[PDB]
Design an enzyme around this catalytic site. Structure first.
Site, PDB file in Angstrom:
ATOM      1  N   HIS A 122      -3.859  59.544 155.160  1.00 33.20           N
ATOM      2  CA  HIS A 122      -4.832  59.775 154.092  1.00 33.20           C
ATOM      3  C   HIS A 122      -6.262  59.905 154.619  1.00 33.20           C
ATOM      4  O   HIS A 122      -6.915  60.937 154.450  1.00 33.20           O
ATOM      5  CB  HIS A 122      -4.771  58.654 153.055  1.00 33.20           C
ATOM      6  CG  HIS A 122      -3.428  58.484 152.411  1.00 33.20           C
ATOM      7  ND1 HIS A 122      -2.285  58.207 153.129  1.00 33.20           N
ATOM      8  CD2 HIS A 122      -3.051  58.531 151.111  1.00 33.20           C
ATOM      9  CE1 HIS A 122      -1.261  58.094 152.300  1.00 33.20           C
ATOM     10  NE2 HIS A 122      -1.699  58.289 151.070  1.00 33.20           N
ATOM     11  N   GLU A 137      -3.903  52.197 157.396  1.00 35.14           N
ATOM     12  CA  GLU A 137      -4.526  53.268 158.167  1.00 35.14           C
ATOM     13  C   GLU A 137      -5.783  52.797 158.883  1.00 35.14           C
ATOM     14  O   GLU A 137      -6.058  53.229 159.997  1.00 35.14           O
ATOM     15  CB  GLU A 137      -4.823  54.481 157.288  1.00 35.14           C
ATOM     16  CG  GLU A 137      -3.566  55.159 156.758  1.00 35.14           C
ATOM     17  CD  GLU A 137      -3.855  56.505 156.136  1.00 35.14           C
ATOM     18  OE1 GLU A 137      -4.864  57.132 156.523  1.00 35.14           O
ATOM     19  OE2 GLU A 137      -3.076  56.931 155.259  1.00 35.14           O
ATOM     20  N   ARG A 170      -4.427  40.845 129.623  1.00 34.19           N
ATOM     21  CA  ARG A 170      -5.418  41.503 128.761  1.00 34.19           C
ATOM     22  C   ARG A 170      -4.750  42.032 127.493  1.00 34.19           C
ATOM     23  O   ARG A 170      -3.904  42.924 127.559  1.00 34.19           O
ATOM     24  CB  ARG A 170      -6.127  42.651 129.490  1.00 34.19           C
ATOM     25  CG  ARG A 170      -6.847  42.255 130.762  1.00 34.19           C
ATOM     26  CD  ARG A 170      -7.789  43.352 131.219  1.00 34.19           C
ATOM     27  NE  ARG A 170      -8.260  43.150 132.586  1.00 34.19           N
ATOM     28  CZ  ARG A 170      -9.389  42.522 132.897  1.00 34.19           C
ATOM     29  NH1 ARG A 170     -10.164  42.035 131.934  1.00 34.19           N
ATOM     30  NH2 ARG A 170      -9.751  42.378 134.168  1.00 34.19           N
ATOM     31  N   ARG A 227     -14.334  36.372 131.276  1.00 32.91           N
ATOM     32  CA  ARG A 227     -13.156  36.508 130.417  1.00 32.91           C
ATOM     33  C   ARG A 227     -13.104  35.381 129.389  1.00 32.91           C
ATOM     34  O   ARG A 227     -12.518  35.515 128.318  1.00 32.91           O
ATOM     35  CB  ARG A 227     -11.866  36.490 131.256  1.00 32.91           C
ATOM     36  CG  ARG A 227     -11.685  37.657 132.229  1.00 32.91           C
ATOM     37  CD  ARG A 227     -11.035  38.878 131.568  1.00 32.91           C
ATOM     38  NE  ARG A 227      -9.835  38.549 130.795  1.00 32.91           N
ATOM     39  CZ  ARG A 227      -8.589  38.642 131.250  1.00 32.91           C
ATOM     40  NH1 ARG A 227      -8.349  39.059 132.483  1.00 32.91           N
ATOM     41  NH2 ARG A 227      -7.575  38.318 130.464  1.00 32.91           N
TER      42      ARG A 227
END
Lengths: 250, 250, 250, 250, 250, 250
Positions: D5, D77, D165, D220
């Site tokens: 990638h 990678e 959530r 939250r």
């Protein structure tokens, strides 16, 4: 006997590749009354079988008895006996309130609530119906005008606790199995049954197509009491659907 | 922006109950271009959406990124934005010797090895495609003349160790994932990709239509490296199949 | 019929707090015949019950079918019908070289590999025999002169892949089940059958007395095929042991 | 391209051993604006990277995109590309009420809520940050005067269900994932994120140090609405902390 | 020292095959005060042991300390040291309301709430007591006139959370462990303890018989405060039961 | 006694928010002796506490016994008695070739293989050391000149089968534990001990500061048996490190 349980020969099945797979022996003959030249082959334990022909080709109606193991053994042996395509007929309760008594269920795939499918595939592998078997059933369902739901059904290794049935002795369901009715409910799971996930899994894995259809004769979630004709009248429709769907798998 | 990640609003989608969901931002644009009046909407990170028309009906193309985590969000926010039908398009490689290069795969169900699928339904539950979308995509593959296989695709939550790649320079793969290549291969699975088991599962248990389609750019056992005039045709082939299918799901 | 499956009522059982529970419909009849005033009651599918007397006390013999699924129901409905004590009788084969053909096995506990046991208590929980029944069955085996082994029996939810049978023509057995033959064998387990871990577990966690007894028709490692004048004697031997035991549990 | 990638060369990274690992591409350049001679290296899909120098040594800022897989691939990678030390910067919500918006989180170790880390280690193996990477961050945090919490953070394979959530489509979280907010809450778990546990696990296992820091821009669990400066103002502080902490890892 | 911990020789045990296995060192001597020619053998860490004779044969009273590991090590080493039969004595709280303080528990099998037994058998394998060891205890219990419950006991790897004890620091029990008191309660599980399942499992597997007995000195579920004599008076009864039961295992 | 097991009260601890927690009763005494005004408090079974001063501050030394079961209690009751900071000291052996004899190991995190850790937080959750204690113990090892490795330590719930010892005379180790020696070794783990994953996990999820330190008495791959003038120096070396660290945590 050539197999273990079934006790059938390659021409005792007449090389029939396709099977129809009810759970109960008295539905075997029934489904077999719709197809020509029928013969009760054998009842060894729960393995009552008949053999008839469909559009000219020999086909097998065979009872799985209850659960993955006797379905396994059947299916295994049926596969041992040369069965490629399997079609499961039956009745069910809906665990989903949008669904009515008398309707027709086509199951795309199953929840593995057995231990039986865990035998034919590592549990990540879904309990899933072949596309072409599922396509026949849809096409067959619409053609008798069914109210046809296509969706997932839950396949349990136990009638009562796996299906979260409290009307038994215990009134108790194991922690692992409690709340699962709604868990499947809101997920959209159409219904419960014991046999499929094994049948689906073992067919998925082995180069054998499977599919399943059912009439809804009761509702785990609903009020009104269905007429006595609940079983019989709805069973005709779906037995006829499973035969026609079969006639299109040849 | 009516959602946390994408950067879209409702008038953006212009109706459009159906989204096409490729992995990469790059493939996204081209897809919508095959359709009517494409317009770049939002490029944020792995999430890139485009708007385009099909038979007078707005379609969304939106990138889902790499694996089930980024997958799960876009799907969520697209739906959160009003899209009920999802179609993943992509390219892959074939863990089954009968499957070629330039081959299309429609997936009915995914092996759930990715842990991002788990956040929706247990491994008991199958990661299942929507029958109506699978039918649309098969009838599409059949409409474009594609050489198609229909079956199970394996899904991992990591490119390397969940896909059983010791290609990684650590070269490790913890015990639970070891053996699955020729395991799934004997077990009927068509290929390997990291997204489907997150989406199909997600849509099955969210009440959404999902289906998937993939061009096979490589058959990985067979040591032929595919045409040096490339895998770009087999992607251009599959991108028709999704657009053709979609056309029939509108 | 006061239960969903069997086809029995209460006056049917005639008192009878204790049922004998063979697997197959066929073995059922003979068992009750050794007792007093046997009467065929209900034959439905894998479920076949008989009523018979012992020292002026009604006993039930009822078939449980193949594996834990069908097992779990009959047990449930028998109990649901008022039977608190269950005694499984059967025949098996011996995964331990010291265990012969013509051998009796009483099981105190079962290895739970069957997934139908799971619907009751977690793998944390042991699938345990009722001490009073185990005592009755041991004192029975000892009363008939039987050569007995007392220990653990392994239980699977499928004849083939859970019992680690690659005898299946797929020949597969997913990874979790691989190795268990000489594993359990080194680990003390006597034999393999698919029912006990569903029942014992079921009775242990339902508040019921369960115990099990089995004739060994084959010692499977040792390659001697047992007497051509058959395993029918070792079944007729074990069927006394259950009737003798029961006699002492009344 | 040398890698898969990233598409980077040993001197395209300039042999840089250390990386800075935000999830988002527009933070890549940002973090890179703090260090000399910067160059956008490559954006392939979500793999936008820059390269600058720190105290004289070449270092890499690279986006992981969302989740373990694109973080894996990146990290893999990056490790393929010679990366020893990884430092994760970002923002978070606190699930713990003793914690405020604007504060700084240093994570010692993570909960594995992914499937991605389960790829680099057998799940018993904790998702844990290197000591020296964690020491830098603390030392770097205190020096800009941060309110600095050192603790465990939860790393999820899904934004919404894994983080419990309910503001999504379903409003539903799977049984397995329900109540987990408080489960982590009272356990003391500081926050949620998607990426780390993979990064932590794969670095823990491979002889590559990892650590993670974050600004808390939302809660939250809490009431007051943070000013628009919530992201930007707190992000400066933590981006500056991650660079300085990096400058002390050389 | 010949073993690891115990530090005992074949004749330092005097070839004693049978052991008596309390958890605490001051009960070692106690149990040893009931049998002739006693000698404290060794206390290394928690491994206090005594040696006396029973009906003429040398027997070992040895403390397991707390938990599967020190019981393992003990039992392992005891098995290393030639121990065939193990008998566990102790006291317990009842989690079942039908049970009283002062009564006697004989455990047929255990719940595996440890990680310790998972070391000697694959978790499906039940934690179960030998029949003949269990038979002695019953026979020994009745003969001092005990109120004797025969049933399953839960064996935990932690005193407080595994036993669902909220009277600790946290007041918190992990999600996995919450509700388990009633889970075992209604299942019929007689009590909690830490040690057995290991002892039972490792004896089950290895050709070594095990059994366990206990006096009930408190009730996790009940109101009335027991007199100070609770421990001492009930402990006599059960220590005497375990010795007599032992005298019948020779 | 204000706790069930130890035998301590509050005035006993004399303030003392910090306890040192060696495994064996024997090592306990010596530790406190290096400190000020040691006083034997309570010796009960595996639980032996001592009280001693450090820079005018009371410290507790208390034995935790063998493995996570006995570990978990003492920790609980010490804390239950008011101790917020725990420091385990011990000696071990090195599963990594670069780790010597006479080597110190500070653990940031433990592989959780012990089942006694599970009673606190799931395998999702890391068994983590308190950063402040790890820093104190590293700065201690660095203050005494110790040759230290900082990383993961593997933790088992049994000396033999969880530590993958076939050293046991059964020689078995059920499948889940097989392979982990050179597994963890390639995977970065420093050593093996049965306590840490119970404590660190316990303190992390109880809101307590925990850290661990160990002398390596043996490097087990390398076949050199360490100096015949013994491992007693490497224990006397590590016991300074804990006392030095503690000194800085007061």
């Amino acid at each position: 006997s050539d197999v273990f349980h079934l006790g059938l020969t390659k021409n005792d099945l007449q090389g029939a590749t396709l099977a129809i797979v009810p759970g109960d022996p008295q539905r075997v003959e029934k489904i077999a009354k719709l197809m020509d030249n029928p013969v009760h082959l054998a009842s060894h334990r729960e393995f009552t079988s008949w053999r008839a022909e469909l559009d000219g080709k020999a086909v097998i109606v065979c009872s799985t008895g209850i659960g993955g193991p006797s379905t396994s053994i059947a299916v295994e042996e049926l596969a041992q006996l040369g069965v490629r395509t399997f079609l499961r007929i039956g009745t069910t309760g809906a665990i989903q309130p949008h669904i009515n008594v008398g309707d027709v269920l086509v199951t795309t795939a199953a929840v593995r609530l057995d231990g039986a499918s865990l035998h034919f595939a590592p549990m990540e592998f879904p309990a899933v119906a072949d596309f072409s078997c599922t396509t026949a059933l849809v096409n067959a369902a619409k053609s008798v005008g069914a109210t046809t739901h296509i969706g997932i059904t839950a396949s349990s290794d136990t009638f009562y606790p796996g299906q979260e049935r409290y009307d038994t002795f215990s009134g108790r369901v194991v922690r692992h199995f409690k709340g699962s009715m709604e868990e499947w409910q809101s997920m959209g799971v159409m219904n419960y049954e014991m046999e499929s996930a094994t049948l689906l899994t073992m067919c998925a894995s082995q180069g054998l197509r499977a599919g399943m259809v059912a009439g809804v004769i009761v509702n785990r979630t609903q009020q009104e009491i269905p007429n006595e004709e609940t079983m019989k009248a709805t069973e005709s429709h779906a037995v006829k659907i499973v035969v026609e769907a079969a006639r299109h798998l040849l």
